[PDB]
Amino acid sequence: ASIPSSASVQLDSYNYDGSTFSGKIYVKNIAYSKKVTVVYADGSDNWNNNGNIIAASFSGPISGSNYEYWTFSASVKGIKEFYIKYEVSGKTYYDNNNSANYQVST
Protein backbone atom coordinates (compact mmCIF):
# COMPACT_ATOMS: atom_id res chain seq x y z
CA ALA A 1 0.00 0.00 0.00
CA SER A 2 2.95 2.27 0.80
CA ILE A 3 5.31 3.35 -1.99
CA PRO A 4 8.59 5.26 -2.60
CA SER A 5 8.63 8.97 -1.94
CA SER A 6 11.14 9.80 -4.64
CA ALA A 7 13.57 7.03 -5.62
CA SER A 8 13.48 5.80 -9.22
CA VAL A 9 14.04 2.30 -7.91
CA GLN A 10 13.77 0.97 -4.33
CA LEU A 11 13.58 -2.47 -2.67
CA ASP A 12 10.07 -3.71 -1.92
CA SER A 13 11.15 -7.01 -0.34
CA TYR A 14 13.69 -9.84 -0.36
CA ASN A 15 14.08 -13.38 0.98
CA TYR A 16 16.75 -16.24 1.15
CA ASP A 17 16.01 -19.91 1.61
CA GLY A 18 19.52 -21.18 1.72
CA SER A 19 18.56 -22.39 -1.67
CA THR A 20 16.82 -19.50 -3.36
CA PHE A 21 16.92 -15.79 -3.33
CA SER A 22 13.73 -13.91 -4.28
CA GLY A 23 12.09 -10.54 -3.88
CA LYS A 24 10.20 -7.55 -5.17
CA ILE A 25 11.27 -4.04 -6.18
CA TYR A 26 9.60 -0.63 -6.62
CA VAL A 27 10.24 0.76 -10.05
CA LYS A 28 9.43 4.27 -11.20
CA ASN A 29 7.81 3.94 -14.65
CA ILE A 30 9.78 6.69 -16.44
CA ALA A 31 10.09 5.05 -19.88
CA TYR A 32 8.71 1.89 -21.52
CA SER A 33 11.85 -0.23 -22.04
CA LYS A 34 13.50 -1.29 -18.82
CA LYS A 35 16.36 -3.15 -17.23
CA VAL A 36 16.26 -3.89 -13.53
CA THR A 37 18.74 -6.32 -12.04
CA VAL A 38 20.02 -7.45 -8.67
CA VAL A 39 23.77 -7.72 -8.26
CA TYR A 40 24.89 -9.63 -5.18
CA ALA A 41 28.15 -10.55 -3.51
CA ASP A 42 29.77 -13.96 -3.00
CA GLY A 43 29.10 -16.19 -0.01
CA SER A 44 32.61 -14.87 0.63
CA ASP A 45 31.39 -11.33 -0.15
CA ASN A 46 33.18 -11.03 -3.49
CA TRP A 47 31.43 -8.99 -6.12
CA ASN A 48 33.03 -10.71 -9.11
CA ASN A 49 33.28 -7.27 -10.78
CA ASN A 50 29.50 -6.76 -10.61
CA GLY A 51 29.14 -10.14 -12.29
CA ASN A 52 26.86 -12.09 -9.93
CA ILE A 53 23.68 -10.88 -11.59
CA ILE A 54 20.01 -11.67 -11.43
CA ALA A 55 17.49 -10.22 -13.88
CA ALA A 56 14.12 -9.14 -12.56
CA SER A 57 11.04 -8.66 -14.69
CA PHE A 58 7.82 -6.66 -14.74
CA SER A 59 5.01 -8.21 -12.65
CA GLY A 60 2.48 -5.44 -12.33
CA PRO A 61 1.74 -1.70 -12.02
CA ILE A 62 0.78 -0.08 -8.72
CA SER A 63 -2.60 1.60 -9.11
CA GLY A 64 -2.86 5.23 -8.18
CA SER A 65 0.79 5.75 -8.94
CA ASN A 66 3.73 6.17 -11.31
CA TYR A 67 5.50 3.17 -9.75
CA GLU A 68 5.40 -0.54 -10.54
CA TYR A 69 6.45 -3.96 -9.33
CA TRP A 70 9.25 -6.09 -10.68
CA THR A 71 10.08 -9.52 -9.32
CA PHE A 72 13.18 -11.65 -9.00
CA SER A 73 13.63 -15.26 -7.92
CA ALA A 74 16.63 -17.44 -8.74
CA SER A 75 18.83 -20.25 -7.44
CA VAL A 76 21.79 -19.01 -5.43
CA LYS A 77 23.96 -21.10 -3.10
CA GLY A 78 26.25 -18.40 -1.72
CA ILE A 79 25.29 -14.80 -1.01
CA LYS A 80 26.50 -12.19 1.49
CA GLU A 81 24.88 -8.98 0.12
CA PHE A 82 23.36 -7.18 -2.87
CA TYR A 83 22.27 -3.96 -4.51
CA ILE A 84 19.72 -3.14 -7.20
CA LYS A 85 20.53 -1.52 -10.55
CA TYR A 86 18.04 0.13 -12.96
CA GLU A 87 18.66 1.35 -16.53
CA VAL A 88 16.18 3.31 -18.68
CA SER A 89 16.36 6.11 -21.27
CA GLY A 90 20.12 5.64 -21.20
CA LYS A 91 20.24 6.64 -17.62
CA THR A 92 21.22 4.51 -14.65
CA TYR A 93 19.77 4.51 -11.16
CA TYR A 94 20.55 2.37 -8.15
CA ASP A 95 19.23 1.20 -4.83
CA ASN A 96 22.25 0.65 -2.55
CA ASN A 97 20.42 0.96 0.76
CA ASN A 98 22.20 4.28 1.32
CA SER A 99 25.62 2.89 0.39
CA ALA A 100 25.54 -0.11 2.73
CA ASN A 101 23.72 -2.42 0.31
CA TYR A 102 21.46 -5.23 1.50
CA GLN A 103 22.98 -7.90 3.75
CA VAL A 104 21.53 -11.37 3.41
CA SER A 105 21.96 -13.20 6.73
CA THR A 106 21.04 -16.59 5.23
Ligand X SMILES: OC[C@H]1O[C@H](O[C@H]2[C@H](O)[C@@H](O)[C@@H](O[C@H]3[C@H](O)[C@@H](O)[C@@H](O[C@H]4[C@H](O)[C@@H](O)[C@@H](O[C@H]5[C@H](O)[C@@H](O)[C@@H](O[C@H]6[C@H](O)[C@@H](O)[C@@H](O[C@H]7[C@H](O)[C@@H](O)[C@@H](O)O[C@@H]7CO)O[C@@H]6CO)O[C@@H]5CO)O[C@@H]4CO)O[C@@H]3CO)O[C@@H]2CO)[C@H](O)[C@@H](O)[C@@H]1O
Interface contacts to ligand X, rule CB under 6 A: 29, 32-34, 58, 68
Residue nearest to ligand X (CB): 34
Q: Are 40 and 49 in contact (CB under 8 A)?
A: no
Q: Which is nearer to ligand X, 46 or 58 (CB)?
A: 58
CA 43, CA 80: separation in Å to the nearest integer? 5
Q: Are 56 and 70 in contact (CB under 8 A)?
A: yes
Q: Which is nearer to ligand X, 9 or 79 (CB)?
A: 9
Closest separation in Å from C-beta 89 to ligand X: 11
Q: Which residue blocks in 28-95 are alpha helix, DSSP H?
A: none
Closest separation in Å from C-beta 34 to ligand X: 3
SS3 for 31?
Answer: coil
CA 92, CA 73: separation in Å to the nearest integer? 22
Closest separation in Å from C-beta 73 to ligand X: 16
Q: Which is nearer to ligand X, 34 or 85 (CB)?
A: 34
